Design a protein around this ligand. Structure first.
Ligand code: UPG
Ligand code: UPG
Ligand code: CL
Ligand code: CL
Ligand code: CL
Ligand code: CL
Ligand code: CL
Ligand code: CL
Ligand code: MG
Ligand code: MG
Lengths: 310, 310
């Protein structure tokens, strides 16, 4: 809706950029573990055919297990390569989508994986880390849980990277649409980032958007329910953006739009994106589908599950 | 709104892709001029500081003047370089925004220029060609007016280019948002293209979006008023996309979104886009503004102007 009271200049100097944004986090693992105060921490790595990188990501996190980190799980998304055994050989516990929630048949896409991981974990804090990262840094998890353990009233922490400019979908799609529909959320540098942490109570009580909608849906639902102050962001360091083909990004953009529209009361047509390429006197069409149906809050399945929710 | 009856596969094979889309136009200038049937044609080149290219674009069109083309105008957008004299030396008539409509003070942006050119031209058909093109082809104008002169019921023709993949704002922003909000318009390959033609009656009767919103606003207003059949597209040939910085494209995307939202009943916040860059412990913010106010249909000023509307 129309917000004539707010300007981009206002947003450029928002107090949130000072109080809830850490460009140089200096927390130590020891003071984070001392601040757990009985809360447990689960780290979840979604993985669809990431045999080349999953072990490297796991090993950056494995030394924390039994100290800061209580559970280290790779949620296997139906991989056909060697993802599972390499994750196990690197020290992670691996759980398939079926084992995570056997009563419900798996759907494709990343949101399904993160949603199912709620039923597979027990931590009061859940940290999500992508398993395709080529150069993961071992301070990812400590930085992501810092604001949850050492600030007040934070329930969602987004990890951003400094650019040595950035992601095309982030800068052209997600952030301009957030300026139009949820302008305070443009304070978040990288709303589509895959490295973030949330408290279980929050995550059990929001729907999970399907496919690549999941990050932006969680950000907007958190903002709508709890306000900007409940969100924080932390600099995870320098990561160069790797190249993805424009055609993949366009299908992903379509789903980001559908998920944002469904959270913001915008009636999305539900129609997938067609992409055309030259042929002769006609085109070579390429289509993708979009989903407008969330997985409901995991709390709604409570008491119906053979493995009980924590 | 929700369109469960339409699918991307339906759109990939839409009859419109056959009847209103020309990948190999073979009209001759002679048969186009014979089909004018008393209609006149005005060619308008908006130009803001294009001294290096404007003359080259004009010269590709100048041989048509007095035959197919009745008026060849560069609408000078407040240039401070040598745009005006180079356009004149290349054979164009040059009209400033002030001279085009002296009763109204100029606003910045491309939409203002195209809107004012309606008052400066007399043609029954108006062709818009960007003045920054490095390699303009002399068949642009003939191809753009072909469907207007030789088809039935066409009022807007969009020129597209084959890629020797494409524009980032087009593929990630405009076309996925059109899939969500006006899915039939995803049949248009390049909705943000600057080379297009329209009939005067249509163009005098729609508002003109400001800045870079103007192309997408004209496309959606034409579709809403007249249907997909009233729109056509023609292959202008091979043009490689030149590189523009991501930060420019993000501000442009924000305005494309605001204009699309204003045509589709989506309440846009009106808040401009902030972009952040690393500094030290803080950021270097960069802001841009967005406009939600159109210029009204030029027909509404009819009879109030010292130079009468055609
Ligand atoms: O069905 C799926 C798809 C992906 N993944 C995993 O999820 C991660 C991210 O998937 P990827 O295709 O690499 O996403 P990106 O292209 O990097 O997309 C960016 O933007 C998306 C939209 O917010 C986020 O979900 C991503 O984490 C973020 O990196 C990887 O570990 C994948 O193996 C699954 O487990 N299952
Ligand atoms: O205030 C302005 C801005 C631009 N122009 C002229 O308009 C043309 C296009 O401007 P440019 O900044 O080069 O646009 P693009 O980055 O190429 O934007 C693409 O996408 C836009 C959104 O639809 C279209 O308006 C453009 O024509 C299209 O080329 C050029 O001849 C400019 O000189 C003006 O006359 N006045
Ligand atoms: Cl390995
Ligand atoms: Cl599946
Ligand atoms: Cl991105
Ligand atoms: Cl010159
Ligand atoms: Cl101006
Ligand atoms: Cl583009
Ligand atoms: Mg990735
Ligand atoms: Mg240009």
């Amino acid at each position: 809706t129309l917000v004539p009271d707010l300007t981009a200049t206002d947003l450029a100097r928002h107090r949130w950029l000072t109080d809830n944004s850490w460009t140089r986090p200096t927390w130590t693992v020891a003071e984070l573990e001392a601040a757990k105060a009985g809360r447990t921490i689960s780290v979840v790595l979604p993985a669809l055919n990431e045999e080349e990188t999953v072990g490297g990501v796991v090993e950056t996190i494995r030394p924390l297990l039994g100290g800061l980190v209580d559970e280290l799980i790779v949620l296997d998304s139906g991989s056909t390569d060697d993802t599972e055994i390499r994750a196990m050989a690197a020290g992670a516990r691996v759980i398939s989508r079926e084992v995570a929630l056997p009563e419900v048949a798996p759907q494709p896409g990343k949101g399904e994986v993160l949603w199912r991981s709620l039923a597979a974990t027990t931590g009061d804090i859940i940290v999500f880390i992508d398993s395709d990262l080529i150069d993961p840094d071992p301070m990812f998890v400590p930085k992501l849980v810092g604001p949850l353990l050492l600030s007040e009233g934070v329930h969602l922490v987004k990890g951003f990277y400094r650019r040595p400019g950035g992601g095309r979908v982030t800068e052209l799609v997600a952030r301009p649409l957030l300026a139009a529909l949820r302008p305070e959320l443009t304070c978040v540098l990288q709303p589509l980032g895959g490295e973030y942490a949330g408290t279980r109570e929050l995550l059990m009580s929001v729907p999970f958007a399907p496919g690549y909608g999941v990050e932006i849906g969680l950000l907007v639902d958190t903002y709508d329910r709890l306000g900007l102050d409940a969100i924080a962001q932390v600099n995870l360091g320098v990561r160069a953006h790797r190249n993805r083909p424009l055609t993949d990004l366009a299908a992903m953009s379509r789903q980001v739009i559908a998920t944002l529209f469904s959270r913001c009361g915008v009636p999305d047509s539900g129609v997938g994106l067609t992409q055309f390429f030259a042929d002769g006197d006609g085109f070579s069409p390429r289509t993708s589908e979009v989903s407008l149906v969330d997985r409901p809050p995991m709390n709604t399945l409570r008491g119906k599950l053979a493995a009980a929710l924590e």
